[PDB]
Every structure is written in structure tokens, then in C-alpha cells.
Design a protein around this ligand. Structure first.
Ligand code: HEM
Ligand code: HEM
Ligand SMILES: OC[C@H]1O[C@H](O[C@H]2[C@H](O)[C@@H](O)[C@@H](O)O[C@@H]2CO)[C@H](O)[C@@H](O)[C@@H]1O
Ligand SMILES: OC[C@H]1O[C@H](O[C@H]2[C@H](O)[C@@H](O)[C@@H](O)O[C@@H]2CO)[C@H](O)[C@@H](O)[C@@H]1O
Ligand SMILES: [Cl-]
Ligand SMILES: [Cl-]
Ligand code: NA
Ligand code: NA
Lengths: 713, 713
């Protein structure tokens, strides 16, 4: 059946903005997962999980009689898809249970792991999501095998369909680099936003880069992909060594015995995949990655044996039974237990990527320190496991349950608690009047608030106006934020704030974070008055101001907008068309296509463009809140053509005289070209639509201002 | 960017069930198009359209100074996508303005026609939909040129995204038959549900079949395609000759001058396409189809000159300036006006498909009658043009406005007016108890109500339980409806009805249509009571009973369910997997994926399967409304394998003993295989889900019962 995507494979796809509708969700519109979870008996769930660990099922027998290793890997993979570039991936939406991740080759036999958890899921129902369950299970595995975890938070609501994530352009699973859709160029430069070295891998290739078993070269891939997952060297060594203290790999026979992945299997497989024709197909005969490595002498107990083995032997390159490259300890005795036969032992073995931890010079120093000081290794692994499994959960306000760690961590982008009375509606009116009397313009007020609030992304719930981090490094220096203009607005608002705060009694005070947002609201109100409309814009106080020392400057760098179509901004020339970048940003902001449309049209006429660019400013009454963008964009009296100097800028001329009326970018004109977008533009550019435009704009503006407000949720 | 569709091109697509979310709709959740329309000043809209017809725009100059012909073709193409097989296509959703229809080759330059209408659309805003305006414009064209239309109804609400329609499997526009994805097999048998001869055509090829200019053979394709759009021979001749009384074709130069269709065009084209490098690219130089034919001596006035020319001349095969086959009158004078140069005239010309009307023997008889009696022609055309443009609008209750024709037409599947008081809540309770006391079983009551209500399809809003057409030919004899069992249930309910109606005062009575649905409600309540749950199923009276004489038996044939996964029914062996046919039925029913899942799981345990098949009946308490379908389907203690006799039937055996527990079809087991469906089955198969299952089942049952109830809108 030929589809629009077949005919026009480069047209923009808006269906990413209308995922996650109430149509696909089986839960009622009022379901609130936080409330369900807070009534869960978490202790009962953990007892059931502890029981499960050693309750072997014959259809996927437990190695060493204990599923802990399999579950740790399951959780680590759940979390391990995360990319700091866009925040997408991670454990936080339980997407391991949907395509494509349920069928990635690196996720082989994690279908079995999830199936073992069905009876617990069924027992507790809506009170524990799959997303929370996967992580909780990892934690229980660790605790069952003697490792004390740093804590656990619930609150990852389940999702009901696959996320639209760019995982790469390759058309072959696991394709090595340098092909027609290579994710690598230059000196092994991985394309943003990717965080894995081959299509269908979590981070790196366990044999080495593109299969080449060189631990030093593998270390480079480890370091880059883990940095792209928000992990530094210490955290990386702690995680890999900690993980590989447990369990084993599976490669008992040739890979060609392994059948279809779950999304390709037959209906009778009932959601499972990788059925193997090798011997019994399971247990002692299991084939998962094709490697056959058992790291420690006690694979079901926390030990300091990983680093004893890594440093205590010299290693020789060998092959598993499936033909994969791995390493065996020279001259060692058979000290490693077998997973099924008590009369068998094995020599110590390692992956290429384990040896990276010894042969990369920067890892070797950390590895040695951990070998010499195992308490340091335990604490670092516990912290890094927490970070790994919570990195995408957002502000601490979203953490639920009785095991949330009290300690505030820098990676959480923490916001200080509010400890004083908040401004009321009378105070808000008085502060908006002060802001309007200061001489700040609609353009400056709107731009500043937009800059502050539109750093939010729903993918990992980072960013937003809470914290007033716009005033700190590095946000205050981002080019899209217009640093010199921003400084002048912030100095004015800070003087207003100091004067209001110094006049108060009690402990009442306003944060700069709230004032930035409030001042934006005053700008929108003033713009509406400029247009002859009487509008009050909703405002909710309670933001607090974070400090510089609570703001990790290197972690904040990924939130920098290099493309922000809402301000007609593009930092450089990219291979992705700017209107695709617009849709991508709207998805991060949680906007639908009508919301994106309305917002952008209003921002253009309010003066939100970076550098006061006239591109898309299709009005003769700038700083007034009108639907002029749409009415002028749709006027057939204007003809558009790309300019000779720049194929991405367009000139709109009167059709009868040739006279220049406007200029616009791709982001501007897509609203008059894309057949669905133009349908939405038409609604707002109709003669009956001015009051609808204003009200819809105010609603979307408010939505953006509140995106990070989980304190109010 | 590689997508799930790329990796698993044959996995089932559920996104067709989640279109049309409130996310994608710019109108508020409360917007009611009927209420907006009813306040439109339709007379003022028509005066503006009348003025437009002769107000030429220089970017697409009006042929003969009059846009009437262009707009008639626009409206005909809007309606002309309709197929009776599934009800999809047609004018009723305004889909001509979205992909792919906006860029079909047969729709070339209708982009210009729609653009001409933007000012009027903009003026009237939400009070007139694009979908209504397309049709209205064609009526006003006809009226302005001297043709009296049969009437006009508003009420086609606009849609905001493309419909998911199977338009064929060809990967090349206009591909000739006999390719690798041929829509023809056997002796020129067009595959259901298609109703056009080539990908991107409305009906047929105007040169002849696969380009062969033989009028006799073209007639065969005309007759088949028009029958598949619900038009008979009389209506077909009236439509084609009526349309071709007006306007002209456009083929002034070679087709290679014409550039990309709108979905492929550059962003600067602002939604238009087919930009032509031939001379001025428009007006006298226009190229649309490649043909260059002007049918009558007065292209901007209704006449009987099409048939005068068709019968008054002999025709010679010739070529247009673009090289297309077309026909010219032998020895004729230059009597046809030129569209732009008043000093030039041309000979009469015809399409191959026009000559069909004279050279096919059955058409010739109708065409002669019309030639001899042009008042007969005018009436037939007016009736057919109304039918064409309203055939997908649904029940007459959805018609709006002051020009709705009072005459009731058989094709409308009409329902008599109700002229008596309706039963009240107490009456309904009395009837449900009488039905339960009669000895009819849950299975009989559920199955009968399902059979009556589930003929509805949202594509053309035909079918449903209103009318009680289940008691008439042909529904009473459809195999899926179990004709002997149905007859027994209907005799019982009719006796209950006669006894209740005979006892009443004041003219209160209950229709059989209402009682069928109420009896089904009683069944569902009783099933719930069987499970230990007291529920009342909502019921809304006001259905009426249609007569056999008000039911067109041949038209009703396309509503027969040959595949109804909800009753585990497949009439024959198809090349499309049954699970695909389930999702297609769910889309026709207007169900989401959660609604489809709940509904199916409940129907299985209520006894709704055709023939009392045990497939999917995963319960030991049949006729009790429980979630047993899901809890048993998801039980990992059962292993499933295809049977040796039939690969589409599966046995579920206990994994440990081998004992046979269940059998199921692909429609049953898709819910335990598809990763999105299984996530939905999990919610209903959880230990906390019995109350939720019952409530959601009752809600979707009631939705299905009410699908045709536009009297309550
Ligand atoms: C460079 C990073 C890493 C690489 C290349 C990697 C590679 C793999 C491979 C290939 C397997 C074998 C899969 C199979 O055949 O069953 C595996 C197993 C496993 N990994 Fe990793 N790993 C990495 C990091 C992690 C981290 C960060 C953790 C957790 C903190 C983890 C925990 C596990 C555990 C527990 C297993 C054993 C599974 C079982 O017992 O069934 N690994 N690893
Ligand atoms: C066998 C069925 C049909 C065939 C093959 C067919 C074919 C065509 C083609 C090839 C053109 C020229 C497109 C262009 O070059 O501008 C056209 C024009 C047109 N057709 Fe048809 N047609 C059919 C039926 C109908 C029907 C049912 C009607 C309406 C009742 C209709 C009304 C018109 C009108 C009014 C025009 C002139 C458009 C103009 O003036 O711009 N046709 N036809
Ligand atoms: O984090 C330290 C400090 O950074 C900024 O310093 C400001 C100053 O407070 C402003 O009011 C204005 O004069 O510009 C300075 C330029 O560096 C923050 O604005 C401030 O809240 C924070 O304490
Ligand atoms: O059985 C189908 C049939 O049922 C009802 O008609 C009754 C009729 O009213 C009685 O006289 C009875 O003894 O015979 C029929 C039952 O066969 C439906 O209302 C009717 O339209 C339908 O044919
Ligand atoms: Cl994601
Ligand atoms: Cl459709
Ligand atoms: Na994420
Ligand atoms: Na339709």
C-alpha cells in the first residue's frame, strides 16, 4: 500500500507532534500515575522481586540459579539509550517494551527478562509502571547480590506507543562505519545527536571499534559515547566494572542459529524473539551477543574480583564459540564457575572493552584506585547507578516514594526550596506596572521570557525558567540569547526586584526567576493593548533562583539552542532543513502543531526574532499582538522567490508591481507551503479569527512559561 | 532517519486508529461546525462566489473570462475519489487539500482553483468548511451558467490531516496495468477496494485503457469504475455529458514543460504546483492533462450542444500539442470559441471517453434519449450531481441549511420520521426485564445487537442499527449474521414489541430498531451480573424502522462484513492477514486501539463469535463479562503453535503437560504478539482491572450502538 512518506519521503512529518494523544492511551484522561504509585506497597513489590531472582523458569533458565545479572543488564539497557544532545532515550518512558528498542540486537533476550516480570506487573497493575519496574528490578538484583544501592525514585509514567527518535540513518542492523549512511566522519566524529557507535547498540561494540579488538581504540569510543550519555571517566569506569562484577555473556554456539527479533517473529512467539536452534536454545546453550565471558569467581555476589582479575593476569586474544573476539587470562587456573554444571570451571575472561579500563591511561589510574580502595569503587558505582537510572527524570520534585535519596546532586540541576511568602495578585499587578513604566519594550520583555522558558525539553525534563539560570553562565552568553541585550534587561529587572524586595514586610520576596516570567507576561499584555485588546495573562509564582555553583556549566551546554525557529535563529548551516529543526524543537517543548503555529505567528509580530531580523515579521504594527503573520503570509498578492545570495532566504514581492514587501526564511514560509501547516495558518488568518488568535496565543505562552513547574503538578 | 516501518514493513499499523486527535485540530474541543454553519449567510457566500466566476486573476487567467468549468471539475474531483467498497474517499472531509490527493496528476491545477477560493474562505472563516465550499462553488458555477441544481446541503466538517486510504500498491504515478503491483488481474478485474484504473486517476484514462484510444474498450472501464462509485449507466452518461457541457481541457504544449506536483514543489511555490515553463505557463498556454479539447460552442453556458456535437459529426483520431490521443470532428467548420482570442475559432473535439457515450451500445441508447429530450438530460444530471456530491454525507439528519432537497432518495438509505412519544427510562427497564424473561441468552442478545449496529462505517456514514435493516433483505441473509439464529431472535423480540406497543396509551410505541439495541444492552447487563457486577448500560431511544421498499438491496451489498474480527469471522481466504482486516474494521467503526482491544476481549467471552466458535473464547465462564480473555491470553504457562491443518489457527497448550487449553486465530493472538496491542491487553489483564474492563467495555458498546445517531447530534 503506497503511503505519502513513499511518494514524498522528504516532506516534513508532523505526526511526531500528535503522538501520545488521549486516543492511544488506555488509561482514563484523569489517570494520575503519581497518585497511583504513592499508594503502592513498594516493600511488598520488592519482596516479590527478591523471590523472583531465584525462581527459575524452564523456558529461560536462570544462570547460576539467579536472574540478577540478566536484570541488571535489562535495567542498564533501559537507561542506556539516553543521549544528552536531545535528552531522548533513557529509562524514563519504558520504551524498551516497544519497537524498535524491543528488537535492537543489543537488547537480545531482554524480552525474556521483561516476560519474567509480567506476573509482578499483573499483580500490582497500574500502581507500578513498566518504566519504574524495570529500574526497581535492577535495584533489587543488586541488593539481592549484596550491593547496597544509593536509593530509588518512582514516577516514570508508562507510555503507549513508540517515541519518534532519530537513532541513525543506516538501513542495516549493526552496520560498520563508513557506509552510505555513516554516522561517523572525519577523525571518528560521531554525528549529533547520536550516542552509539552502530545502529542497534547501546553504546559501543564489545569486540572493539568496528569489530577491531584494540582496547585502546575501544576506550576512545567508550569515553565519547558515555560522555554523550552524561557520564565522565570516573562514572564510566565505576559503571562498567560494577556491572561486570555480575553475571555473564552468552555465546555458546554460532549466531546463525538465532532467529527473528521480536518485531519480525511469528505471531505464535507471543511477543518474544531470537529463538535459537542451538541445542536446547537456552540456559547452558544460550546465545545473546555471541560472546562467552564470565568475569568473576562469584557471578551472583558483589565482590572486588573484577579488578583483581583485570590487573592480576595478562590477557590473550581468543574467540568465543560463535567466533567473536574476546580475551582469556594467560596461564590461569579454571577458577570461574560454570552457570549450569557444578563439575566445570573456566579460566577468567574479559571483553575488549573491559581491557580498555586497564590499557587506556586515564582509565587505568581510576581502575587502580578502585582496585586499591574498593570502598571508593562501591560508592562511586552506587552513585553512578543512581545517576544512570534517574538522569532523565527531571527535577527532584518529580521523585516519588520512600527511597528517594536526600542528598542533592549537581546533575539534577537543583533549585533551592522556597522558604518565604510568595507574591499575590496585587503584588503581581504592581510589579507588571513597574516593569511597563521602566521603559523595557514588548520586544525585550517577550524575548527575555522566551529565552528563559524555552530551554525546557520534555525528553529529559531539563531546562525551563525555574532557577533563573538565564542570568548565569553559560546561558547568559549564548548567542541565541542576545547577550548584550539580555544583560541590559536583567539589570533593569534586578533593580525592580531589589526595590520591591526591600519594601516588603514579613519574609515576602520575589525571585528573579518569577520576575523574568512576570515581565514577559506584562509584555504580552502590553502587546495586546497595543492591538486594542484587553487581555490578562495568567502567572504562577514560586520559581526560585539557583546559584552558579548549582549550575554545572558543561552539562548546561547541551541545552544551548543552535536552532530556534521561534526566534528565527540558526547558529550555522546544517544538513537538516530548518523546518525539520522547528518541528524537532516543538516536540521538545511538548507543543502540538496548532500550538507551534500560533506561538510562532505571535512571536514574529512581538519582536522575538534574534537580532531584530525582519524575516517573518509580516506586519506594519510590530509589538502589537495581532494575527498579521498569518493574514500576510497567505496573501496571494505576494509572490515568493529564494534570493541569489542565500537560497534559504526568500523575498515576497507584489505580484502586479514587483515591489519588495517582505523577506522570510524557510521556517517562516513552511507555514504557507506544507499542506497541513497551511491549513492551520488559514484558521488563524481568517477574518473571524483575531480573538481566537489572541486567546490561543496566551494559552500557549502560559504553557511554555510553566513547562518545568513540577512543584505545582 | 530509519523508522519502524522501514525495519518491519509488514508489522501492523495502529496509527490509522489515532488520527483526528484533538492535538491536531486547531478548533477548540467545543467547536461545533453545524452550529457555525447554521448561522452562515449562505446567500451572501453564493453572491461572492457568483462574482468570483468572472473575476479573472492574472496568475491563472479564466478561460473565456469564466472560472465555472474549472470549479465544476474541482468539485467533481473532490467527490470523485469515492469508493462504495469501503466508503472511503469522496468530498465529505475536504481531503483534496491534503496529501496525496492535492498532488494526484488527475488533480493538476486544482491547486489554482482552491487558491482562488481563499479570499471567500478567509472572509467567512469557520462558518463554512473547505469541504462544504468546494461543493458549493461547483453548484454556484453551474447556477451562474444557467443550470438549475437539485439542491445543496452543508455540514461536511473540515479535517486537519490526511486520511489513511489504500489507493493501490503501485510505486509509480499513473503506472500502466500489468506491472509488478498491478491493480488488475484475470480478464481486466480491478482489485477491491479500488475504483480507478491507474494510480493518481479519479476514474479512467481519458485517452483509453492504458492509453489505447478505443471508445468501446474505454466504455468498459467507465462502467466498472462508475459502478464502484455507486453510479449506474444513466447517471454515468448524465454526469460525463453534463460536466463536458462546460469548459475545456488544457494541453497547449509538451508535458515535459510541467514541473513538480505541490507536495514536491519548492517552499517558495507556497502550496501550488505544476509550474509550467511553456510560454506564459497559464491561460492560453496552460497545460493540465495534456489534452486540448473544448466540447461546446458555448463553454460558459448550459446547452444541449455536447450531444449535438457528439451525434452530429464523425470523429477522427488526432493528437494534442502535447501528444495525447484525442478526436476532432471530420470536415467541420471552426465553430468553437477560443478561450482568449476572440478572432479565433476551432473545430469540435472530443475525448476517447466522450465517444464511449456513443459507441457503447447501452450508453448510446441513453445518450440518444438525452439528445432528443434535453429536459430529461438536465433532470438526470441535476439528480446525479446531487448524489455525486452528497453520497458520503450520511443520514439526511446531517444535512444542513436552506437548500436541502425535500425529496427523499433511495440511495440515502432513508429512515422514517418518528411521529410518536418515545419510551422512557422506566419503559426501557420494563423491556430489558421482558427480554431477559423470554429465555433469549446473553449470546443471542449481544450477537444480534452487534450484527445490527456494526454495519456502520465512518468513511461514508452508512450503516448502523437505525432502520432495523437487519430484518430485511439482504442483511437478514448475510452469513456473518447467522440467518436462522437471527430469525429466531427477531421473532421473539417482535412478539415482545407487539405486546408492549399494544399495551400503551397516547401513541407511545417502541420501534424494532430501538428494541434490538435495548435487548443487546440487556444482554450486556446480564453478562455483567453473571460476573457479580451490577451495571446499567446507557440506551438512547429514537430509532425508526425502515421498509424493504425504502432499502436498495444492491447498494446494501457493500456493507456485508466479509471479515469481522470482532465475531472471529472471515468469509473466505484473503491475501491480507486477518489482523490487518481487524484494524481496518476498527477504523471504519471509529475505534481507537484501546477501544478495539476492550471490545474484542469482551465480545469473545460474551459468545459473539459466528457459529459459536471456541476460537479466542478464553474463559470457563462464557456469558459472564469478565477480563478472562486478557488474563488467559497473557499467561506464560501456555505455549502456542499453528495447527497442521490450518496455519491460521493456533493451539494453546500447557507448557509443562502438553494439555490442550484453547484454540485461537490470528485475530485473537495478535493481542499477545503486537507490542502495542499487548501493552494494552496487559492493562486489562492486570489484577486491578476488572472494574475498569467492565466500565470501558460498556462505554465502547454504547459508542457502537450510537454510531449512526446523527438525530441526537
Ligand atoms: C562499554 C560498556 C559496556 C559494554 C560494551 C557491555 C557489553 C556487554 C555484553 C556484550 C554483554 C553480554 C550480553 C549477553 O551475551 O548476554 C554484557 C553483559 C552484561 N553487562 Fe555489560 N557492557 C557495558 C556496560 C555495562 C554497564 C554500564 C552495566 C551496568 C552497570 C553492564 C552490566 C552488565 C551485566 C550485569 C551483564 C550480564 C548479563 C547476564 O548475566 O545475563 N554492562 N555487557
Ligand atoms: C469518464 C469520466 C471522465 C473523464 C475521463 C474526464 C476527463 C477530463 C479531463 C482529462 C479533463 C481536462 C483536464 C484539463 O486538462 O484541464 C476534464 C475536464 C473537465 N471535466 Fe471531465 N472527465 C470525466 C468526467 C467528468 C464528470 C463526471 C464531470 C462533472 C460532472 C466532469 C467535468 C469536467 C469539467 C467541467 C471539465 C473542464 C475543466 C475546465 O474548464 O478547466 N468530468 N475532464
Ligand atoms: O552568580 C553570581 C551572580 O552572577 C550575576 O552577577 C550580576 C549582578 O548581580 C547583576 O545584578 C548585574 O549587575 O550584572 C552582574 C554581572 O556579572 C547575577 O545577576 C547574580 O544573581 C548572581 O549572584
Ligand atoms: O423472524 C424474522 C421476523 O421477525 C419479526 O416478525 C414476526 C411476526 O410479527 C409474527 O407474526 C411471527 O409469528 O412471525 C415473524 C417472525 O418470523 C420481525 O419484526 C420481522 O420483520 C422479521 O421478518
Ligand atoms: Cl524517547
Ligand atoms: Cl478518506
Ligand atoms: Na528521554
Ligand atoms: Na468517505
Amino acid at each position: 500500500g503506497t503511503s505519502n512518506r513513499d511518494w514524498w519521503p522528504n516532506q516534513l512529518d508532523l505526526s511526531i507532534l500528535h503522538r501520545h494523544s488521549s486516543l492511544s492511551d488506555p488509561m482514563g484522561k484523569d489517570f494520575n500515575y503519581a497518585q497511583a504509585f504513592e499508594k503502592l506497597d513498594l516493600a511488598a513489590v520488592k519482596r516479590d522481586l527478591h523471590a523472583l531472582m531465584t525462581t527459575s523458569q524452564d523456558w529461560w533458565p536462570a544462570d547460576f540459579g539467579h536472574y540478577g545479572g540478566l536484570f541488571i543488564r535489562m535495567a542498564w539497557h533501559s537507561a542506556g539509550t539516553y543521549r544528552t544532545a536531545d535528552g531522548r532515550g533513557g529509562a524514563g518512558e519504558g520504551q524498551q517494551r516497544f519497537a524498535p528498542l524491543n528488537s535492537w540486537p543489543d537488547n537480545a533476550n531482554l524480552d525474556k527478562a521483561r516476560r519474567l516480570l509480567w506476573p509482578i506487573k499483573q499483580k500490582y497493575g497500574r500502581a507500578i509502571s513498566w518504566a519504574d519496574l524495570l529500574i526497581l528490578t535492577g535495584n533489587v538484583a543488586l541488593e539481592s547480590m549484596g550491593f547496597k544501592t544509593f536509593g530509588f525514585a518512582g514516577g516514570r509514567a508508562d507510555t503507549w506507543e513508540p517515541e519518534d527518535v532519530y537513532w541513525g540513518s543506516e538501513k542495516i542492523w549493526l552496520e560498520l562505519s563508513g557506509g552510505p549512511n555513516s554516522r561517523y566522519s572525519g577523525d571518528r566524529q560521531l554525528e549529533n545527536p547520536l550516542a552509539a557507535v552502530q545502529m542497534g547498540l547501546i553504546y559501543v561494540n564489545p569486540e572493539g571499534p568496528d569489530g577491531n579488538p584494540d582496547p585502546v581504540a575501544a576506550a576512545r569510543d567508550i569515553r565519547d559515547t558515555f560522555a554523550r550519555m552524561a557520564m565522565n571517566d570516573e562514572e564510566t569506569v565505576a559503571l562498567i566494572a560494577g556491572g561486570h562484577t555480575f553475571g555473564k555473556t552468552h555465546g555458546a554456539g554460532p549466531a546463525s542459529n538465532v532467529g527473528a527479533e521480536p518485531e519480525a517473529a511469528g505471531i505464535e512467539a507471543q511477543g518474544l524473539g531470537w529463538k535459537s536452534a542451538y541445542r536446547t536454545g537456552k540456559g547452558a546453550d544460550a546465545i545473546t551477543s555471541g560472546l562467552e565471558v564470565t568475569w568473576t569467581t562469584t557471578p551472583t555476589q558483589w565482590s572486588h574480583n573484577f579488578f583483581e582479575n583485570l590487573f592480576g593476569y595478562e590477557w590473550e586474544l581468543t574467540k568465543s564459540p560463535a567466533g567473536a573476539h574476546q580475551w582469556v587470562a594467560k596461564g590461569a587456573d579454571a577458577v570461574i564457575p560454570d552457570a549450569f554444571d557444578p563439575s566445570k570451571k573456566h579460566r577468567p575472561t574479559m571483553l575488549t572493552t573491559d581491557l580498555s579500563l586497564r590499557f587506556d591511561p586515564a582509565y587505568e589510574k581510576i581502575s587502580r584506585r578502585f582496585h586499591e580502595n574498593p570502598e571508593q569503587f562501591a560508592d562511586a558505582f552506587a552513585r553512578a547507578w543512581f545517576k544512570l537510572t534517574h538522569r532523565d527524570m527531571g527535577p527532584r520534585a518529580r521523585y516519588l516514594g520512600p527511597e528517594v535519596p536526600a542528598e542533592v546532586l549537581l546533575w539534577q540541576d537543583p533549585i533551592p526550596a522556597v522558604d518565604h511568602p510568595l507574591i499575590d495578585a496585587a503584588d503581581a499587578a504592581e510589579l507588571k506596572a513597574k516593569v511597563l513604566a521602566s521603559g523595557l519594550t514588548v520586544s525585550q520583555l517577550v524575548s527575555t521570557a522566551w529565552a528563559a522558558a524555552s530551554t525546557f525539553r520534555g525528553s529529559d525534563k531539563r531546562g525551563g525558567a525555574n532557577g533563573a539560570r538565564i542570568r548565569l553562565a553559560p546561558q547568559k552568553d549564548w548567542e541565541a540569547n542576545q547577550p548584550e541585550q539580555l544583560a541590559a534587561v536583567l539589570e533593569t529587572l534586578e533593580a525592580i526586584r531589589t526595590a520591591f524586595n526591600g519594601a516588603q514586610r514579613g519574609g515576602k520576596q520575589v525571585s528573579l526567576a518569577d520576575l523574568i516570567v512576570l515581565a514577559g507576561c506584562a509584555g504580552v499584555e502590553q502587546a495586546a493593548k497595543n492591538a486594542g485588546h484587553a487581555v490578562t495573562v495568567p502567572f504562577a509564582p514560586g520559581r526560585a533562583d539557583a546559584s552558579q555553583e548549582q549550575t554545572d556549566v558543561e552539562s548546561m551546554a547541551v541545552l544551548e539552542p543552535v536552532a530556534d525557529g521561534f526566534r528565527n535563529y540558526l547558529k550555522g548551516k546544517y544538513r537538516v532543513p530548518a523546518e525539520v529543526l522547528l518541528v524537532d524543537k516543538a516536540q521538545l517543548l511538548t507543543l502540538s502543531a496548532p500550538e507551534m503555529t500560533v506561538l510562532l505567528g505571535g512571536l514574529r509580530v512581538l519582536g522575538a526574532n534574534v537580532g531584530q531580523s525582519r524575516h517573518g515579521v509580516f506586519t506594519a504594527r510590530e509589538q502589537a499582538l495581532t494575527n498579521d503573520f498569518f493574514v500576510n503570509l497567505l496573501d496571494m498578492g505576494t509572490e515568493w522567490k529564494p534570493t541569489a545570495a542565500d537560497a534559504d532566504v526568500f523575498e515576497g514581492r507584489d505580484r502586479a508591481t514587483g515591489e519588495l514587501k517582505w523577506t522570510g526564511t524557510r521556517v517562516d514560509l513552511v507555514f504557507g507551503s506544507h499542506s497541513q501547516l497551511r491549513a492551520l495558518a488559514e484558521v488563524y488568518g481568517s477574518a473571524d479569527a483575531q480573538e481566537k488568535f489572541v486567546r490561543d496565543f496566551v494559552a500557549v505562552w502560559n504553557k511554555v512559561m510553566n513547562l518545568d513547574r513540577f512543584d505545582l503538578a
